[PDB]
Amino acid sequence: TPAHIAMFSIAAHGHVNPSLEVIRELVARGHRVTYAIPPVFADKVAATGARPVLYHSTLPGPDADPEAWGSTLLDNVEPFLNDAIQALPQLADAYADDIPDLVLHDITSYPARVLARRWGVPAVSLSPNLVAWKGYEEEVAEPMWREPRQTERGRAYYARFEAWLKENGITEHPDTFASHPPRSLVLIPKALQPHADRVDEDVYTFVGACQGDRAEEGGWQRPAGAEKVVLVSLGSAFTKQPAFYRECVRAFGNLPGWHLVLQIGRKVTPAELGELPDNVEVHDWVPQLAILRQADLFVTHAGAGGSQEGLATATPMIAVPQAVDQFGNADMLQGLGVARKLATEEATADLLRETALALVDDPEVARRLRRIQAEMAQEGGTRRAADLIEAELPA
Ligand code: NA
């Protein structure tokens, strides 16, 4: 008689993709898994074998640019409260006489936390980004929150948040409720966790290893004259670059022994790029892994899949973030001695080239990558996380 594990997330790729493999494995293990998700991701979720439970989220669909979330931290954070308040009852009612044995959820789902409590079952939080360490509150939250909190808006945000939890028997402060889960699996490698020396390892277990995505075998496969392959697979931060994808051509084009995979405004759109040399393939859509598995350098936006897979593929990286969060990845990657940090004003054909020739020729870069790949192997992937989830399953 199967345990019911209820998963919760929102319609955003970065909050669904990282755990799809885990959900897939839990189903493969015989658990009955339901997955609360908006309709746009129903197909995506059903493909894991989980039953989608549909609800209406007022958050921006997975198909939205980052003008659409908002410009200050209260603009970033309020939407999750607003959504949660109108999603809670939908979800409570959809699960009314089918109370799960265990609640799993991406960090964005406030309803999941509330319902786990209301139902008196354990919740397991699944983080696709870094988590709080012991000390973050004083260290980091304050000043960041220091100002918005003495504004009329921030006092009302926090007021409404209190009241809403109070409605649901919860007395934890909202910052506690939101940012400090009792139990969490962190889906990024420890190597990419700030001040990771201080994460509480009763609460949090790191499971950041590649287990999965398209584990496909063969994507594109190296032309058998390609000494050094450089995939440029998010290298940018998704913004217009009629100079950066072209700076990449000038860096690697006709560079003896090199071969350059570019991936563009992934809607085609150009004959900017111009007179492509013979060792330069450009595409709108690539299989970042089979490539990375045979690539020797990776120019990247450096988000989770991207910082992770290059580490996972022991591929040194030229870090081209263009976002404060990936500025922390960049100096973290760079901090580990396996990448050099670059912004677009900086990522010019010359400096791309000499940095590329540094990194691929640095035998210690390779040794460090080996080191990190081994630590991620240990952390475990899908089976690992699935184990940890079972180990909670009021069973
Ligand atoms: Na490699």
Automatic annotation (TrEMBL):
<comment type="similarity">
    <text>Belongs to the UDP-glycosyltransferase family.</text>
</comment>
<dbReference type="InterPro" id="IPR035595">
    <property type="entry name" value="UDP_glycos_trans_CS"/>
</dbReference>
<feature type="compositionally biased region" description="Basic and acidic residues">
    <location>
        <begin position="381"/>
        <end position="395"/>
    </location>
</feature>
<dbReference type="GO" id="GO:0016758">
    <property type="term" value="F:hexosyltransferase activity"/>
</dbReference>
<feature type="binding site">
    <location>
        <position position="301"/>
    </location>
    <ligand>
        <name>UDP-alpha-D-glucose</name>
    </ligand>
</feature>
<dbReference type="InterPro" id="IPR050426">
    <property type="entry name" value="Glycosyltransferase_28"/>
</dbReference>
<keyword id="KW-0808">Transferase</keyword>
<feature type="binding site">
    <location>
        <position position="309"/>
    </location>
    <ligand>
        <name>UDP-alpha-D-glucose</name>
    </ligand>
</feature>
<dbReference type="InterPro" id="IPR010610">
    <property type="entry name" value="EryCIII-like_C"/>
</dbReference>
<feature type="binding site">
    <location>
        <position position="237"/>
    </location>
    <ligand>
        <name>UDP-alpha-D-glucose</name>
    </ligand>
</feature>
<dbReference type="InterPro" id="IPR002213">
    <property type="entry name" value="UDP_glucos_trans"/>
</dbReference>
<feature type="binding site">
    <location>
        <position position="236"/>
    </location>
    <ligand>
        <name>UDP-alpha-D-glucose</name>
    </ligand>
</feature>
<feature type="binding site">
    <location>
        <position position="286"/>
    </location>
    <ligand>
        <name>UDP-alpha-D-glucose</name>
    </ligand>
</feature>
<feature type="domain" description="Erythromycin biosynthesis protein CIII-like C-terminal">
    <location>
        <begin position="271"/>
        <end position="379"/>
    </location>
</feature>
<protein>
    <submittedName>
        <fullName>Oleandomycin glycosyltransferase</fullName>
    </submittedName>
</protein>
<dbReference type="GO" id="GO:0017000">
    <property type="term" value="P:antibiotic biosynthetic process"/>
</dbReference>
<feature type="binding site">
    <location>
        <position position="285"/>
    </location>
    <ligand>
        <name>UDP-alpha-D-glucose</name>
    </ligand>
</feature>
<dbReference type="GO" id="GO:0008194">
    <property type="term" value="F:UDP-glycosyltransferase activity"/>
</dbReference>
<feature type="binding site">
    <location>
        <position position="17"/>
    </location>
    <ligand>
        <name>UDP-alpha-D-glucose</name>
    </ligand>
</feature>
<dbReference type="Pfam" id="PF06722">
    <property type="entry name" value="EryCIII-like_C"/>
</dbReference>
<dbReference type="InterPro" id="IPR006326">
    <property type="entry name" value="UDPGT_MGT-like"/>
</dbReference>
<feature type="binding site">
    <location>
        <position position="305"/>
    </location>
    <ligand>
        <name>UDP-alpha-D-glucose</name>
    </ligand>
</feature>
